[PDB]
Design a protein around this ligand. Sequence first.
Ligand code: MG
Ligand code: MG
Ligand code: MG
Ligand code: MG
Ligand code: MG
Ligand code: MG
Ligand code: MG
Ligand code: MG
Ligand code: MG
Ligand code: MG
Ligand code: MG
Ligand code: MG
Ligand code: MG
Ligand code: MG
Ligand code: MG
Ligand code: MG
Ligand code: MG
Ligand code: MG
Ligand code: MG
Ligand code: MG
Ligand code: MG
Lengths: 135, 122
Amino acid sequence: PTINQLIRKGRVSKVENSKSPALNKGYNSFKKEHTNVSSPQKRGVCTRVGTMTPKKPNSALRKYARVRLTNGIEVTAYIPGIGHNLQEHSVVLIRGGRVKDLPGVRYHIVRGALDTAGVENRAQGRSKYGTKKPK
Amino acid sequence: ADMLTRIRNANMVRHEKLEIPASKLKREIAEILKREGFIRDVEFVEDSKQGIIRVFLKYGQNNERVITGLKRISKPGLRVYAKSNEVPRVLNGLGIAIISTSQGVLTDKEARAKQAGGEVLA
RNA sequence: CCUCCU
RNA sequence: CCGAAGGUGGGACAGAUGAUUGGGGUGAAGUCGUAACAAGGUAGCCGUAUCGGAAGGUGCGGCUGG
RNA sequence: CGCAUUAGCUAGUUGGUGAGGUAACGGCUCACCAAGGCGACGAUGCGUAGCCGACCUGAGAGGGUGAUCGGCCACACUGGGACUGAGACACGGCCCAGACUCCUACGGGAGGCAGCAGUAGGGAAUCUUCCGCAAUGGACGAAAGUCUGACGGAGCAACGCCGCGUGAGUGAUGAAGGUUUUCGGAUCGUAAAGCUCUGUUGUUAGGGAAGAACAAGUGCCGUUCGAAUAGGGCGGUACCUUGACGGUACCUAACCAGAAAGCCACGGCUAACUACGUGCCAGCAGCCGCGGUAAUACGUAGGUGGCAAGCGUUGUCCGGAAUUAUUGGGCGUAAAGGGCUCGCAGGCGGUUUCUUAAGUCUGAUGUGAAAGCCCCCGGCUCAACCGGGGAGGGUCAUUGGAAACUGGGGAACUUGAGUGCAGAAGAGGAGAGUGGAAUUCCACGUGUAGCGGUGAAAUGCGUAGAGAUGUGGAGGAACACCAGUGGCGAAGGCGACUCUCUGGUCUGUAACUGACGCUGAGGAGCGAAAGCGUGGGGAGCGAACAGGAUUAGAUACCCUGGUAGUCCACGCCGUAAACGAUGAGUGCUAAGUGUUAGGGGGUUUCCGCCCCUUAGUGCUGCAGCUAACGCAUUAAGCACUCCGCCUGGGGAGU
RNA sequence: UAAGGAACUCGGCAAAAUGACCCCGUAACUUCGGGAGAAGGGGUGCUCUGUUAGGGUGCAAGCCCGAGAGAGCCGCAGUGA
Ligand SMILES: [Mg+2]
Ligand SMILES: [Mg+2]
Ligand SMILES: [Mg+2]
Ligand SMILES: [Mg+2]
Ligand SMILES: [Mg+2]
Ligand SMILES: [Mg+2]
Ligand SMILES: [Mg+2]
Ligand SMILES: [Mg+2]
Ligand SMILES: [Mg+2]
Ligand SMILES: [Mg+2]
Ligand SMILES: [Mg+2]
Ligand SMILES: [Mg+2]
Ligand SMILES: [Mg+2]
Ligand SMILES: [Mg+2]
Ligand SMILES: [Mg+2]
Ligand SMILES: [Mg+2]
Ligand SMILES: [Mg+2]
Ligand SMILES: [Mg+2]
Ligand SMILES: [Mg+2]
Ligand SMILES: [Mg+2]
Ligand SMILES: [Mg+2]
């Protein structure tokens, strides 16, 4: 672009999108408005628990929750961990990671916000699945 | 009024000489360039046009130039005015910048001394 | 005319 | 006199929600054909019109990226 | 600061004059006059936001943030108003209104946690209903002192940063002990086994901080006031007194290195592997990707580099990202040249000279707090920290120069750009008329059984005489040959002939003009084909539609018909692979060879040949360019000006 | 015609309400004309200033038309029917 052109119309940066939009909206009960607040986790209530087939080249029954958050946005979120952590309609905490297989699942259910197990007797970094170290 | 491209183009094809329409500052540039050792002489003729004489810059008198690989760039119509303090040096020496002043030109020392940075070349 | 999935 | 709040009125704007409806995206192994890629078996593609379950077909003009 | 998918806004609005008000200038308020003011340099509207010192990041340009700490601003349950005064149009006031809390024997009163603590609620999430004014600072008072949730402390919380550590050091059984197995092992490992040396700190008892300056109260002496020795105050000068933390930091000294190691990571990026159990299951995943019965990336089990009570996970920002490119990118084919003009604004502009001095440059002076980061950097034992002198800090003033360049004025010039004059070629355009060939239909003569069509057929047309052949008539449309990488046009386009009207280009000449130029958002115009409106026309062709075939089907291709349309006038539409997939202008940078329209010059009477030359139009090919293909004086080369456009694919040209 | 106000009724049938002039203001939608008197609001008597400003007629005197203001006055109510 000519300098004159750059003066007339400047450069425009790319708008980068958040990979976790649901954790960016707060809420107000009074005003009934979403607010712009950078949250690391959001509590929610499980509206549906079940399984879903992953995309190619994988096959599985990937256990997930449709969850209704405090901000009022309904997300899907992956129940992580080996063994039955699926749970039922109940309060849960959520996290920001996509399941590459499952299309739409952009959030994990945090293991440890309530009754959990995950992978018991983890080799190292024993803090990802709510695995209380035994003695 | 760009002698630089005329020079570059002829310099690329190792031309002996070139005829550039004369103007006061294009005359005063060719002499700055001549300070190294280009131009031997010109032929001032009966003036019909104001530049018909040309600059007749002859940087390739012999087969190969001892002063070869002439290169210039910094000549935009957007005006670039240098501070006497912040005058650049081409290649950290080994190259000159024709900094148009009210009274002076050339090196970094010829900026804080002379003053007006004005035009800036390479 | 067509030629399952990894 | 000015005057907050209040009342009345008709507009403006923004969000939520709504029977139903529209395409869109995505989804290991569904159905129908085979349009494109080879001269892809009628060279293809562009604009436009019209027709047809569906890809598409046909007209007119254009392009070669035949 | 964002949005033009916000373009008009304003009516005390804009200025005047007068009066009033105000600490104060002023449509600040009002009266009476006019008609202004603002806005493409973005008014107005909508959205978002306290601003700044700074902070995070980055080579820097930049980008992001504006908790804690300092300054300016604003606000004090919501909203309005004044009072008091030097000063609020009041943070713990009032007056009034509203929604909420409290009291009220109902008439009426009282209050505002965005003060410290705390509670509920919201939330992923953020403390003690603590002690003291000893210190520092306030307010009050002559002082003692009182009040001070300011402030100092302490409680809480790995939420950070960091301490100096949690020793040093002598010491090879390489034991014990581990999970593997080619039934053997090997490394931790001088570190521990066995110790044996020191107290940063602390494992338990004794010493004990600094922080405190004092203010005064008192005793004294020079000074100035003093009717004065009174009697105080103010300069030097004694004496005097007080600690929340707290019996807490720090020291000694034992019990004694005992109390003080951690978390994460080990495919590759990035230095770091094997058993077993699963068997596309269960599960994993930042990216690439692992698992379907031998998983170095999953479940478990045993095994190792960084930084150091944490580190994993998620969230936000900058970097990497020369990935919005000013620094510092692009657009022939990867995303990207507007279909093409005419042009308003704007941007940009040949040469000389003179003058000007806005820009440009430069000297000098003033400020840009403190903290922070940083230059010398010192002190506190170095530190995870505090002081001074500098520096940065300004598209900043003010003033004095310089004057090349950019800009302004004056005078010149002719190379750009036009004019004149003389030639040239052309399917450039608009209008009217005219011609020949062929198709079709109609009529008629001759003639008679097929014609037509396809891969092969059939539907069709024919004995109501087709087809063929001859003659004539009617009508419409398109212009064989000429015809050529030929011509003309801005592009779309333009092809029979003639006339009428009319645009541009090229060459030559330089008489004239004397930068009159280039580009050009928006705007206006033109713009293939198809389509649309009204009215015409309708031969041939032919979307649709029908029939015949073909085929599994055939809403296709092939055949036979055939409507709109194709044509004309006027109007509309505004798009095409509107392509050279290549914006316009200008200059510069090897050659060779065709061709179109000119010009000049050779010996020649021309023709003709040859040389040169301008403007097109092609081909080949240097240098250079390119991811490559290729481009290459008709650049995709080297430059400058201006415009348009691009920023992963989809979603969506929705 | 109290209070109510469509509960009436097949159905607001009938009745009530609205109603003049001046001023402000006026949406969807549209064939761009409209919609529109949309809707919704405000003013309205009398006196004085006042034979107002201004206009018609006329040589003048006069006669006639006549805003908009300001200050008042009265009533439950001013296009008082
Ligand atoms: Mg096909
Ligand atoms: Mg095909
Ligand atoms: Mg069809
Ligand atoms: Mg705000
Ligand atoms: Mg960048
Ligand atoms: Mg392509
Ligand atoms: Mg492309
Ligand atoms: Mg183009
Ligand atoms: Mg544009
Ligand atoms: Mg047409
Ligand atoms: Mg028509
Ligand atoms: Mg046909
Ligand atoms: Mg287009
Ligand atoms: Mg074309
Ligand atoms: Mg194009
Ligand atoms: Mg132009
Ligand atoms: Mg009644
Ligand atoms: Mg009543
Ligand atoms: Mg009823
Ligand atoms: Mg009834
Ligand atoms: Mg009625």
